[model samples]
Target: EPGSARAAVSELMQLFPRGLFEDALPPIVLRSQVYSLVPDRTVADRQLKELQEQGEIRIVQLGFDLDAHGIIFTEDYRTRVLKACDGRPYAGAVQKFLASVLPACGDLSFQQDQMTQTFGFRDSEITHLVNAGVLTVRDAGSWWLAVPGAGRFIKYFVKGRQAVLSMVRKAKYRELLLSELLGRRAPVVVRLGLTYHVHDLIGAQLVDCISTTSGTLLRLPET
Candidate 1:
């Protein structure tokens, strides 16, 4: 610190990587963990703010003081915040939330996966129907399906259509670095996957529910 700003900035850089992976921590606690390295409060405040301004680390909360202790918050590597933070009232919260509990009301129901088959169908016809969705998949690959604030959620049996669509919503972020807090964007991509190919990816409605400092963010299809 006595030497130069660059020299002190280098010291703070060492802690940056640790916060990205260790866990979610209030920025101050993260700084406290390295208070010894910082030594001088004046130098520490200035240097930490340097990293924040550089955008090397994400600052979650606001308010900074002399040492920049207590008010600042950094990601705990445990999680990544969204580029947008727009949330909506989950309408099917009932059917969806209770999906595991099974619909207390029998009127609303999800047919078993095998229900795709019809009665009196021949054995070979049934096989075709059973494997219909998979029959079209040209390649087996992996991709991320992200929610607004939830971050990337990976899925298996990647649909040729849905996989690609899921990627669009996951990859397309609202860019929170610019906005305060915003509404989630409508996912206009996934269902469109059907025009290109056929699969179960259709029918699922996608909604955005993340708000970020930046702006609008897209999301994967709602299941």
Candidate 2:
């Protein structure tokens, strides 16, 4: 009989309500954290086993090592991503791609044809998701689909847009020579992989694309 299992479980439950365990996007508790929480190894293991068997917790093994595992609350992980996509009509598809499909696959970037053949997503549906900012695509002879919310994708996405605006702002009269902006020899577009994002910044009206006789230019939008 596990004498301290109930107490251990109760103590862990208390932290959830206190907002201590809700830190990450998909909340995770390392095995080491669990051991720290319940000082007794046997009791902690017992409570963890109870939680696992009850379908409340899941162990995600990070690597081949035996001790390389972390615990995630089953319902918590599902609900967090679902809630983010709740208001949209394509929430079901986004939830399927983010929660189910992406997690199962090793390759993070999915090509347009792959999404079409493997997941049955139509080109029109993909285009709508891209326009809605739920998904982003990179052109590499073929389109590659990436979720903005995944990993550090949004960080790089926002950085690319900001870089374009700042580059224009730093130039004379808050403008830059378009040829130099996308210099062939010393290119920011190729360097930052931001060729597509430059167009987005201009389309969003954060920067203006001006065509003049002295060569085209990128200028900060009029205030």
Candidate 3:
């Protein structure tokens, strides 16, 4: 069969549409597409390999990395870009292309500046998470002890009258409260008491119900 440039161009445009854009063109995008042109015909030249697909179809070849597959013609961005540049280094283009598909990483415990460069996320983005309460600043760094656990402690601590202060102020009461609750639910109950720094426990309403408290004996919550 004869080499049809028109047929190759048509096929090239269809693969991963918009693949043929700004810098991509025929004889450029054109010359490469023809290499994988498949047609249901017999080639009468060059050992020819009789009776084969001689149409606009392409072959999926695994990359040298053995982890990726590329449709050899228009879909093969690496070959196309290399060909387009006529054998020169294109760091900017390559970097830009790879950036779109790369995975990102960030640590919840990373400090303000440590996170910015490692994952390339802006400083403001990390600060936003800290401000949102979705994350915690602990041991002088960010942390996530998990939300559900906090809710469990808060819910139990505010269960009875003088509860918020009872749990937040008196150390013994906090242990007793958790011990009683964990016994009912029957968790392993490793640690009951927690050490938190709260300046204004009196103004807090951790539990729904409000009641009179023992204003005589001042207290500090469990540790």
Candidate 1 lands at a TM-score of: 0.22
Instruction: Single out the weakest 10-residue window by summed lDDT for candidate 3.
Output: 190-199
Order of candidate numbers by TM-score, starting with the best:
2, 1, 3
lDDT of 2 at 197: 43
Alpha-carbon RMSD, each predicted model: 22.6, 19.2, 27.9
| Candidate 3, 1-223: lDDT as tens digits | 4544345445444432232233342111212223335333223111121111331222222212221112223233344344444433433433332243121221113444444545454545445434432234544644431121223333332342234344434455333332232233212221222211011122222222223352223244322
lDDT of 2: 0.52
* lDDT score, candidate 2, position 158: 49
Ranking by lDDT: 2, 3, 1
Instruction: Supply candidate 3's per-residue lDDT for 5.
Output: 39
User: Between candidates 1 and 3, which one is better according to TM-score?
Assistant: 1
| TM-score for each of the candidates | 0.22, 0.33, 0.21
Which of the predicted structures, 2 or 3, would earn the higher lDDT when compared with the native? Answer: 2
| Residue-level lDDT tens digits of model 1 in 1-223 | 5433335334444433233223222222234323444446577557656655653343322122222222122232112221121132232221122232121221111233322331233334323322321111112321111112211111111233354454445453621211221122323433222222211222122233245544533345445
Question: Which candidate leads in lDDT?
Answer: 2
Model 1 misplacement above 4 A: 1-29, 62-79, 82-223
The predicted structure with the larger lDDT, 1 or 3, is 3
- Residue 129 CA displacement from its true place in model 2, Å: 18
